[PDB]
Amino acid sequence: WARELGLIRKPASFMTSICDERGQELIYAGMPITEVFKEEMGIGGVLGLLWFQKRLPKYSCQFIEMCLMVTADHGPAVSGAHNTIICARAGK
Amino acid sequence: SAKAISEQTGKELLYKFICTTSAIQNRFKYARVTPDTDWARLLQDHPWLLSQNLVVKPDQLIKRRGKLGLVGVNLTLDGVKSWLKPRLGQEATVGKATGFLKNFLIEPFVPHSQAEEFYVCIYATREGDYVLFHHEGGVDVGDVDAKAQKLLVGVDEKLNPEDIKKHLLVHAPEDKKEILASFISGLFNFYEDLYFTYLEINPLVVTKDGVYVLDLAAKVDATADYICKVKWGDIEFPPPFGREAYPEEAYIADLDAKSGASLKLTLLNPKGRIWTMVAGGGASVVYSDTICDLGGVNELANYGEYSGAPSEQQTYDYAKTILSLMTREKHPDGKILIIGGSIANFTNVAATFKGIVRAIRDYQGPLKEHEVTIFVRRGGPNYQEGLRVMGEVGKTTGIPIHVFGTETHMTAIVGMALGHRPIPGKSTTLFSRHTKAIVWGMQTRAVQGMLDFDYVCSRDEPSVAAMVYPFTGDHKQKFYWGHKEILIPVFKNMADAMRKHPEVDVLINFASLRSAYDSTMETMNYAQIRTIAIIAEGIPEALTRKLIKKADQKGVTIIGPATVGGIKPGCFKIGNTGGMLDNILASKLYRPGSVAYVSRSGGMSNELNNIISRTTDGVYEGVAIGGDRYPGSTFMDHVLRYQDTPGVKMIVVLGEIGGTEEYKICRGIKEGRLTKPIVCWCIGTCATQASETAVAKNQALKEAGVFVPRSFDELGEIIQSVYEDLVANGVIVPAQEVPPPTVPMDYSWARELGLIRKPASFMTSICDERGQELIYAGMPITEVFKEEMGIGGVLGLLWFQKRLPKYSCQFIEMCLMVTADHGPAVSGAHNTIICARAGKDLVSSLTSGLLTIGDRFGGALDAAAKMFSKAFDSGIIPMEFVNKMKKEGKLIMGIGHRVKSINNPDMRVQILKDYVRQHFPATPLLDYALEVEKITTSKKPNLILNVDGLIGVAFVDMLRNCGSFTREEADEYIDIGALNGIFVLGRSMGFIGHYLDQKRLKQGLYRHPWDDISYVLPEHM
């Protein structure tokens, strides 16, 4: 109630610039989620908006998706997938 | 701070650290006699006492010892013994000072002529060091300026011995020229390199044999001790010679140095009725001056002082020791206590006065008996609550307490204490609206006050451009600009802050008293800086003289050191002057006025702000030059800087005792340069060179042509009088009072006063990090260690919040050590070894191993505990329970081992089972599980209780069988999962051991074999 009337200041920590959950609709960098879907940007587009806060061009977003899909798996004998299979096989 | 040292230590370090080509005799030849020590030990450790003649002087800082006949010359050992029979240990006087004569210093007497003596006196001034030498022996050395040779040697300047032979040895005899020139050069090198302030050697016996010293006076720069811990040794600062110390005074003295707050007290007349319990040093000084001026000079009991925001126990001890001191005797006119002081900067007045009312309500009885009266006047942040609680305790305890704030004069309560009134290229513009500054160090409170002052003055831009801190990286600090969040960039180095902000002309150095010199020298290499305000206090005087010399060479104005800063209302504020915005809006410092003041102590600047706000229009610019005796900017520079400024109409100067600083103002008024009206008043009379006292300075200024008030009571009156006399000439027009912008309150400040509620989440009951010491459940950590409880004790305090008995804590440790590891082939240890072998740290490897612990791996503890608890609580016999588990199609978990079956026990099940049998008081559930394994071993011999089942059933048995558990909490921690915490905390030991083992064996990254996979992928998708 005393911050609604604006007669107090509290030092606000937790500075962030990647999401605006309040208001009407979700804003990633400066653009709403409906403009994200209307401009037909891919998952590389939301990595551009969330990680770099910039609207990357279409070839950059498609390359980010492309370098995500080759990174997707390299078998179970690698060490992290071995850890995943061990932890999943122990009922977790 | 120049402190006089004992001459014994002075000549000890003189003989220790002299550097000359000549030979200096009497090497370690001195002795000390006190009434405590004997004479046989001093004779046996010093066999040289029977060689030559002896001489004795009092070693208690007594000036003119030979004139009053307190020296024993040309006497032998029993001669000086019989000389010290009627003198050692009792009352003696010199000048005005009378006191106990305690210490005596004894030297080998040198038979000397009147022509072999020499006079040397070297000391520090502002523009350099004075060297005074006279060649004619004895006390009769004549004038010190014409016949005796005087030398100005500069700062950071080498003294050539050729100059000593040229100028210091004009009238000196030719036979002792080179030896005395070498001695003078060595004495100057010693004086410079060990950082003294004053040396005087009146007898200097320079014979053909060598040079002897017989008596000397030495004052050292005591603030340079951080340079000279190793070269002073155990330095000694003797007190001035006088009366002894009272036990209350000694109690105040040794509670003074145990904190970062000044708690001083000195008594004048112990039977007086006017008392001093006063914050702020200048406030106590002007209170003593006004009491001695109003006729209470023979009645002023003491001057006391509490500054630097002392703690509640500190002010409680000080108040009980000073309020238990007028209760010894009474007065026919009553007794008066003054809770006085200036305006506090940031100290909460209400908490200090809560300590005051607790200390008074402890001793209200003798105060009512002795008929005392309390006069209270303070101010600052939240003094309304303090005056209200003094009024409440006055109405409650019956003691008449008369309370005022900043609306009255700060000293006028003294005016009704005796009943005298009825009781109701150096630039002339330092700062402007375009002025930016760089703050050196983490002083975010000061920067926030800076930005608040800039916001309330309707200024468009913040005056803090950057912050410099070498101990952190380049980042940004989040501050307030009114309501808005802004970012001030914090830089590691100074060079990038100077490159990125070329508009900065002010640097405010918040460095310590021993890192300010190098930071100021680094600042002055940049030509954009026109002024540096050095806040730190403690800086040695030679480094300050070097700062002054480079400031005169570069034209940079240095405000300080030992200052709070300087305030220009409407343009800029330095550091912590004024305080927070309570005092700024109280003193109307958001708009410029027409009065400019120069003061020395920063504590009187707040009361000068209050006086100028109340009596006259307001402050245009106010600079406190600092309490150091070598100021970077003097009075005279600031007075000409105001005189060159056309904005001011009058200058108020508040000097103090000592220094010829405003005789320059006197002679500049007589020269006609200073035409604007000046109101000046000298604090520090203390009449309880003759031109250094405040009263002679006062009528010196009065017949100089200055409106000097008679006392501090009429200072605001004479300022108001000259204001009303000067507005009649039509030069001062009062501007229209524009209301300032209003900042919102701070959240921590408004929660300190308790006028807000915030819903506090994050409820916890397992640790109390605040306060004095760590509290786990309700007991401190020292009681944890004193009762000798183990790690099971702190699991009892942290997990269950209960002091478990000794067998329960030892059993918790016991069930932790069997759980510690079970090899690497288990699944979690495999995860730990895999993650540790892939180059990860301890946290990631232990974490990736711990995340395997679930229902299949390590889940037998909690599930076996719940299974046997639900079996025992439902009243089912073990024979029916085994059949019920068999015909439900699931195994009894916690029962069944692979290899170790019958007369081959698990050997850690056995130890835990035995400890539960002798040490637990009652075991229903363990006996139930024993009956279940007696059935299942009759089924198959390897179906014994596992360690995972026995720890579970014995842990439930411990919780529901021992004390302090109320039979829902013993069944609650099982449901929450306290069995899982036992397993994970135990197995973390083995997992960290696995990490350390796989990192110590230095094994590279693991990849599984392809022949142990058997891929079953579909043919084509």
Ligand SMILES: CC(=O)SCCNC(=O)CCNC(=O)[C@H](O)C(C)(C)COP(=O)(O)OP(=O)(O)OC[C@H]1O[C@@H](n2cnc3c(N)ncnc32)[C@H](O)[C@@H]1OP(=O)(O)O
């Ligand atoms: C009546 C009136 O109110 S008027 C006031 C008149 N006088 C004054 O204004 C004096 C009051 N202020 C001061 O004197 C203070 O010194 C201030 C305001 C300059 C601040 O100084 P401080 O806080 O003492 O020093 P600072 O915070 O820099 O730290 C002291 C030392 O700790 C060192 N230090 C800090 N943290 C660590 C650490 N973790 N490990 C090792 N050293 C450390 C700092 O580097 C610094 O070293 P230095 O002395 O070589 O610089």
Ligand SMILES: O=C([O-])CC(=O)C(=O)O
């Ligand atoms: O502002 C300052 O430095 C003085 C201060 O906090 C106090 O002790 O009241």
Ligand SMILES: O=C([O-])CC(=O)C(=O)O
């Ligand atoms: O705790 C478990 O359930 C697994 C284990 O350590 C074992 O192999 O005995």
